[PDB]
Structure 1
């Protein structure tokens, strides 16, 4: 039985949708009981324009990626941009990453971002500290299992998610090209 390869980033562009480009990486641990927890990192298709969202497993609505990073533990902004754009002397990347940055200048610390994610969760907590724990559990186990599920894997998950965003930006700028679904390199 064929299937799409796991733990690999695919940047696609579906024709008729609210968003132009979308980057998915269906992820699996080394044959764990959890199924393929697929995460999409997507870019809207047109004010400001071209915000970047990331629909997350067990989350009803899309969440802007910068909120995801702040919930993951990066309070600052330079640190977050260090995980997405690897060379700061490229202003074309900045011009497309700032529309997503200015979307979330109201969240500045980890706990409010955790609350924001928990409010969008499938099981919304009644109190703040319940949404905090639910979203922390989601980030710890549901999102990106293959890069690691342990006490402290936040830096590795942030690096991989920033890589996913960088891959999406490379397809948006045309620096690279969209991955092919029928390419049996992408099949298992």
Structure 2
């Protein structure tokens, strides 16, 4: 729509089949380090286990994917409450300036306005983004299980061309932002800038 909220989201699988591939962690915007998937799911409102597995794996008979997910739950068992997960994420975020609520507000802001921005401005994010993150992890595991091949960059359908329209659009967005900031500077500087 114009803000573009450009912030890459990455879900990573660690080690290897005989190594830290056991666990899965994700990177959030404006967060110091990555976090395991299960803590994020609990922060989004999916408290019980299984339900998180409902979101991630769409077929219980697919026992291999749940085997791969085992260590994620074995690592997330520590956190059990939504506010606890939000505290964890916010605390990992940055310095503990918000001592009162333990950075709950910061984590809420990040997970509402910067986590998967192409869905935002909606308290239903709790469920929508949770489902989309489950889809992300499902794709990751499917690739890791050799069910599907590695995604190809060269596919011409995965690319877009910025013709005169979008290029002038971003350029003019920057210039108009500069102009509005200058107008605001004149407002703040000059009392009764209204007429001037």
Note if 1:137 corresponds to 2:78.
Answer: no
SS at structure 1 position matched to 2:133: helix
Partner of 2:20: 49
The size of the alignment, in residue pairs, is 158
Q: Deviations over 1:26-51 (max 9, x none)?
A: xxxxx232431211011002487321
SS at structure 2 position matched to 1:129: coil
Q: Which runs of 4+ in 1 moved over 4 A?
A: none
Q: Deviations over 1:84-140 (max 9, x none)?
A: 100111111111001111111110010111011011113544415141110011000
Q: Provide TM-score, normalisation by structure 2.
A: 0.75
Where structure 2 has 5 or more consecutive residues not aligned to the other structure, the ranges are 161-196
Cα distance, 1:128–1:95 mapped onto 2, change above 3 Å: farther
Larger proportion of strand: 1
Partner of 1:68: 40
Partner of 2:145: 173
1:109 to 81, 86, 101: 81
2:124 to 143, 152, 162: 152
Question: Aligned equivalents of 1:183 and 1:41: distance in 2?
Answer: 22
Q: RMSD of the TM alignment (CA)?
A: 1.7
Question: Aligned equivalents of 1:45 and 1:92: distance in 2?
Answer: 18
SS at structure 2 position matched to 1:177: coil
Question: Aligned equivalents of 1:131 and 1:166: distance in 2?
Answer: 30
Q: Deviations over 1:70-93 (max 9, x none)?
A: 011111111111111001111111
- Greater C-alpha radius of gyration: 2
Higher relative contact order (CA 8 A, sep 6+): 1
Q: Provide TM-score, normalisation by structure 1.
A: 0.78
SS at structure 2 position matched to 1:38: coil
Partner of 2:172: none
Q: CA deviation at 1:185?
A: 1.5
Q: CA deviation at 1:147?
A: 2.6
